[PDB]
Symmetry: C3
Subunit: 106 residues, 3 copies
């Protein structure tokens, strides 16, 4: 997928996670987010097409998904255990990471 | 290790995983695959020696191991739990990822 | 944080882990190490300021944290399970990875 299909996959599944009722549904939505975040790590954001492919800011932009992918990983494991409320809370606190990168390059 | 020693480590341990009987053996072979996949992520594939070190295709080639390393991670956790059959099935479905990258740069 | 604040976070938490008594304390210190190791992956080490931003040695330097981040991950999961002694032993065997990179670029 391209960058914004991924971004609309991170967002849709955030709402799904906040509204889910069993482990399976949270586990399902986080698994999608992780694939999306990894695929996103390829792309070149609009704001940085006018700069060099290995701009430091292009490296800052890839590092931001590592933070994100590692927090989906913790969230996912809570879900695999069945601590649904804890998994829901972890997913909710991802918006810090989404919106840190957002104000830089969005 | 170099690129093809790693590739022959991914392959040998695939057969090992498909033929194992306890959690320990699957866990052992997947742990080897993860080290191999990470070490592989360094290398420069033959097909891309004649292109620039930061070719997009050299970045596509490193991204492919992330997909791979993250699916070994799930497989490994099933094994740590003891769901041997589920871990065996996850390892089997890695060949999609092996052969996606393969037709591009192998 | 900058590179050496991260390095002094990896070190402080190593001692903390070796001296902890419950799962929670090990889990706490490893979680800090993982954030530190990821943040460190950005930086450019002193020894390699006088070389190109995408030196192979600058790529070797980022690969070293993957090895490190993936071994904190295993350690952390032992701690989440409550195998404190096993988690303590995993953290102790990280110094191989710390000191492999150290003799290259420290
Ligand atoms: C950088 C490391 C980012 C992280 C982490 C997240 N997002 Fe993101 N986002 C980023 C960029 C550069 C852009 C602009 C891309 C563009 O096409 O203009 C975006 C955009 C979005 C969007 C809008 C999609 C669209 O149709 O325009 C959404 C809905 C979005 N981002 C959501 C989102 C969520 C929920 C995140 C955390 C889970 C998240 N993003 C992380 C860069 C980055
Ligand atoms: C790219 C991201 C790859 C992934 C993921 C996997 N492989 Fe791979 N493989 C890749 C390249 C560029 C090459 C050519 C390297 C060369 O030395 O010519 C290969 C090669 C192999 C081989 C052959 C080893 C040899 O002696 O020539 C094998 C056995 C192999 N690959 C196996 C394999 C398996 C089982 C994978 C999934 C677990 C896998 N590879 C992933 C690139 C990539
Ligand atoms: C490279 C991939 C490294 C890994 C993995 C670890 N360290 Fe490291 N370390 C690295 C460099 C290039 C440097 C020099 C940076 C500098 O500021 O000079 C260091 C330095 C340290 C330090 C000293 C901090 C200071 O105030 O100078 C410490 C205490 C340290 N490193 C500890 C440490 C530990 C405990 C590690 C494993 C858990 C570890 N490092 C990994 C590069 C790399
Ligand atoms: Ca949209
Ligand atoms: Ca609900
Ligand atoms: Ca509901
Ligand atoms: Ca061979
Ligand atoms: Ca068998
Ligand atoms: Ca057998
Ligand atoms: Ca110091
Ligand atoms: Ca003690
Ligand atoms: Ca004590
Ligand atoms: Cu895990």
């Amino acid at each position: 997928a391209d960058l914004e299909d991924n971004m609309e996959t991170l967002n849709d599944n955030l709402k799904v996670i906040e509204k889910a009722d069993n482990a399976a549904q949270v586990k399902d939505a986080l698994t999608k987010m992780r694939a999306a975040a990894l695929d996103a790590q390829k792309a070149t954001p609009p704001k940085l097409e006018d700069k060099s492919p290995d701009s430091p800011e292009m490296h800052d932009f890839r590092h931001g998904f590592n933070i994100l992918v590692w927090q989906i990983h913790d969230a996912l494991h809570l879900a695999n255990e069945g601590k649904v409320k804890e998994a829901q809370a972890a997913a909710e606190q991802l918006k810090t990471t989404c919106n840190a990168c957002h104000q830089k390059y969005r």
